[PDB]
């Protein structure tokens, strides 16, 4: 046993994995075994979801998060997002589950049987954290891998059946993407959009042409960047800016994953394109707008003139103006006027919600959809009692959007903490004071008094 | 083909269980590593075969 | 009689598994019978 | 539901997703066995 107690390693059991920092073989095992765990869950969770799945209920009434991801890719679904074939879901689950055994095998082998360090075994697989060129090479390999991943999505969309398009003319459907957006003005334009209301940065992406085009760009950027990093070593200015150690690199990635976590939270909360409401349920903004739509329809059927109906405050009860004048739904949902959805858009004119369209053109499928979304708003208790906090037990419902937003906020937050923990530690360790202040060389004692 | 399928899958499950306990114990046991390494090789090839068998027979039972 | 015969790591693992089972039963009971809302 | 041929494995399938959690708990059993050294 090498380095497997506190005396020899300097790390207590509860920091046990830090004993692995300079043992590239065992650390490869840890990583491969862990990748096994992720793949295991993906596979097993899918099979669990499928076994529990009732095809004629909406997915979002069934506590499903993985089947919705598969369906968005265009597998197993048809018009309106109806399930036409569960077999693609079965395949995804089984293939992940089988693959996890392989990863688990390699992980266990490297972790307990294989060479503890890889450097003496191989110059290609061995590494020194402080070897800047080797670090950028491995980074380069992984960037190429990621670029290929992004192009796999492009391949599915363009050449292997397409993607589920909630926006498809005549109703949501799986659609092949033949004209992906290549224009860098549009693609990178998203990146420079404000993250505030009515803009929403990248979260605002609202059509599959832009999504696919983005991944073409990202795929090429990642492959080009990967080649770049294999062929180069870090420049002088980068050398002087960073800490070059295993723990430092971990900290950079923790920071990055934290950022991505918060982005994913906002993506699933607001976006209804890559998170189709057919599969994930209505967004918070969507369901609130759907309520206003529902009662506008109801009261207009009863004879209300919804354009001229003045609410208790003086603002229109059903319809009012946004701060820039667009006609929008009234009541509290005034905040949600940036919402856009396939069931609502046919009522939209140049100036916002069109009163003549509202009076004459609302179709029964719009009433149904608005009623459905209003009554599946993403509100519910921790024990999955659907609805407002004062609602009685009856409906077993928490929106997948809530499950996915909350989990990813928690994860992103703790990852920011991990970033700070490890970035601060990497700095201190590099400078040589992570274990405490040298009693005979206490820096503050050589500094002038503040006063 | 349902007789072939349903038992091939049971055999897949059973072997997986044996391997799940067996592989790490073998890897970390001091003696009998020679006998272990071949059994693990055998189990792995047989595990892979059974996956493919179940995979093929799936389409003659679904 | 002799202290050490049954390793402490086994006692902890079994006791811990016992706690998980009983708590698990209590959670099952939240969804069935009295207190289930049904 | 799973295809009918696999229905007998329903109870097994119900349990699988929780297995990753067992790996975390296993780390503690293992450490207890080596006295958290």
């Amino acid at each position: 046993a090498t380095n497997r107690d506190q005396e020899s390693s300097g790390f207590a059991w509860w920091a046990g994995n830090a004993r692995l920092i300079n043992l590239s073989g065992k650390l490869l095992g840890a990583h491969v075994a862990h990748a096994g765990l992720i793949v295991f869950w993906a596979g097993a969770m899918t099979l669990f979801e499928l076994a529990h799945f009732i095809p004629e209920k909406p997915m979002y009434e069934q506590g499903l998060i993985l089947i919705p991801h598969i369906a968005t890719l265009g597998w197993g679904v048809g018009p309106g997002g109806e399930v036409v074939d569960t077999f693609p879901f079965f395949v995804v689950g089984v293939v992940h589950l089988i693959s996890s055994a392989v990863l688990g095998f390699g992980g266990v082998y490297h972790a307990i049987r294989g060479p503890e360090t890889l450097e003496e075994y191989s110059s290609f697989f061995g590494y020194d954290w402080k070897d800047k060129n080797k670090m950028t090479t491995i980074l380069g390999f992984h960037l190429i891998v990621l670029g290929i991943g992004a192009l796999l999505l492009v391949a599915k969309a363009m050449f292997f059946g397409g993607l589920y398009d909630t926006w498809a003319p005549g109703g949501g459907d799986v659609r092949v993407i033949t004209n992906p957006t290549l224009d860098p003005r549009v693609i990178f334009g998203y990146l420079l959009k404000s993250p505030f209301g009515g803009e929403g940065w990248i979260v605002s992406v609202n059509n599959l042409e832009d999504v696919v085009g983005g991944h073409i760009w990202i795929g090429l950027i990642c492959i080009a960047g990967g080649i770049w990093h294999i062929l180069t070593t870090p420049f002088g200015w980068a050398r002087r800016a960073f800490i070059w150690s295993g723990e430092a690199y971990l900290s950079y990635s923790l920071g990055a994953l934290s950022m991505m976590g918060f982005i994913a939270t906002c993506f699933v909360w607001f976006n209804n394109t890559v998170y189709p409401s057919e599969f994930y349920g209505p967004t918070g903004p969507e369901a609130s707008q759907a309520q206003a739509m529902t009662f506008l329809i109801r009261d207009q059927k009863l004879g209300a003139n919804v354009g001229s109906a003045q609410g208790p405050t003086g603002l229109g009860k059903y319809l009012m103006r946004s701060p820039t004048g667009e006609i929008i739904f009234g009541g509290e949902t005034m905040r949600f006027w940036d919402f856009r959805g396939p069931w609502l858009e046919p009522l939209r004119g140049p100036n916002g919600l069109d009163l003549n369209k509202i009076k004459n053109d609302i179709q029964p499928w719009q009433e149904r959809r608005a009623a459905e979304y209003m009554t599946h708003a993403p509100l519910g208790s921790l024990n999955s009692v659907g609805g407002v906090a004062t609602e009685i037990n009856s409906v077993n419902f928490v929106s997948p959007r809530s499950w996915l937003a909350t989990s990813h906020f928690v994860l992103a937050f703790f990852f920011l903490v991990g970033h700070l923990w490890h970035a601060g530690r990497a700095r201190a360790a590099a400078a040589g004071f992570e274990k405490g202040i040298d009693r005979e060389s206490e820096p503050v004692l050589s500094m002038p008094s503040l006063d | 083909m349902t007789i072939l399928f349903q038992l091939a899958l049971a055999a897949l499950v059973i072997l997986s269980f044996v391997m799940v306990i067996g592989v790490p114990v073998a890897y970390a046991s001091p003696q009998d590593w020679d006998r272990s390494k071949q059994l693990i090789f055998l189990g792995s090839g047989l595990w892979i075969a059974l996956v493919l068998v179940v995979g093929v027979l799936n389409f003659f039972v679904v | 009689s002799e202290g050490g015969r049954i390793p402490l790591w086994i006692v902890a693992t079994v006791a811990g598994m016992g706690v998980i089972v009983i708590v698990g039963l209590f959670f099952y009971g939240a969804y069935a019978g009295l207190g289930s809302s049904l | 539901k799973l295809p009918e041929a696999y229905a007998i494995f329903d109870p097994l399938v119900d349990v699988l997703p929780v297995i990753p959690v067992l790996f975390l708990a296993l780390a503690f059993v293992w450490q207890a066995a080596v006295g958290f050294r």
């Binding site: - | - | - | 929780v18 297995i19 067992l22």
Partner: peptide
């Protein structure tokens, strides 16, 4: 219900069994 509790019993014991078998055999824990 009986089928589900039997599965998690075999699956549940697998981990602690690995450790136990290794501890008995003076394995590389």
């Amino acid at each position: 219900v009986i089928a589900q509790l039997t599965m998690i019993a075999m699956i549940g014991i697998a981990g602690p069994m690995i450790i136990f078998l290794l501890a008995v055999r003076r394995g590389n824990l």
